[PDB]
DNA sequence: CCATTTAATTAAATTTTTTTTTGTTTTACTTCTCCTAAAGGTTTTAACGTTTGGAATA
């Protein structure tokens, strides 16, 4: 009851809603974290594309593309192996090196969440994917910790307040 | 005181006829079955993702 609950998937007018309702799903905190990670890594991909003097392999949503093979291509970042070796990439701006090296399993679960889009109607098959507890509690919570570490260090790297989420 | 007869009538087997019944045949509607179509739900396949061993390394 508390807060603004008027935003419901019954967004028609009294009779027309009485006839049919908007397509909708169940939202829960864990899928919300999945979405946060998703949007933030979309932002990260956009910034890479912007400062890149080469293509951005992390920007292709095709099928045969697999985060596994791309990871195998690029590999763990030197000063932090949990990250990825984006330091060697080619930027039109001066290479910041390690600065652009996100974690590993975070990107894995990001890609698996992304490949959801093929059939959104099977929403639950990936609704929670990134932050799933499939112990695994430690694994996924520390993955969230690593992701938010990347988020904050990026934000500080460009003066962005951590509160802009 | 009355026996005579025949004249009219009936009765009856006989004939012939007409009908009536029986089996025969032909043909048409009549149900009985299927074929056909539609759609739906049930099953079959597939895909991804999960978790787990398999192999090698630090």
Curated annotation (Swiss-Prot):
Keywords, ordered alphabetically: Virion
GO cellular component, one term: virion component
Subcellular location: Virion
Ranges in a coiled coil: none
Function, in words: Structural protein that participates in nucleocapsid assembly. Plays an essential role in the proper localization of the major capsid protein VP39, and the minor capsid protein 38K into the capsid assembly site.
Subunit field text: Interacts with C42 and VP80. Interacts with protein 38K.
Name of the protein described by the UniProt record: Protein AC54
Native source organism of the sequence: Autographa californica nuclear polyhedrosis virus
Residues of the full protein shown: 184 to 365 of 365
């Amino acid at each position: 009851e508390s807060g603004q609950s008027v935003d419901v998937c019954n967004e028609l007018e009294y009779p027309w809603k009485l006839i049919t309702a908007n397509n909708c799903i169940v939202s829960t905190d864990e899928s919300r974290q999945s979405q946060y990670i998703y949007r933030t890594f979309l932002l990260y991909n956009t910034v890479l594309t912007a400062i890149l003097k080469q293509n951005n392999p992390f920007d292709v949503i095709a099928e045969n593309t697999s985060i596994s093979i791309i990871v195998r291509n690029l590999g763990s970042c030197p000063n932090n192996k949990d990250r990825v070796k984006c330091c060697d990439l080619n930027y039109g701006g001066v290479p910041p090196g390690h600065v652009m090296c996100p974690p590993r399993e975070i990107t894995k679960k990001f890609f698996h969440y992304a490949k959801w889009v093929r059939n959104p109607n099977k929403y639950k098959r990936y609704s929670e994917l990134i932050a799933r507890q499939s112990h695994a509690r430690d694994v996924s919570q520390l993955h969230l910790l690593d992701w938010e570490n990347f988020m904050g260090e990026f934000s500080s790297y460009f003066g962005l307040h951590a509160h802009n989420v």
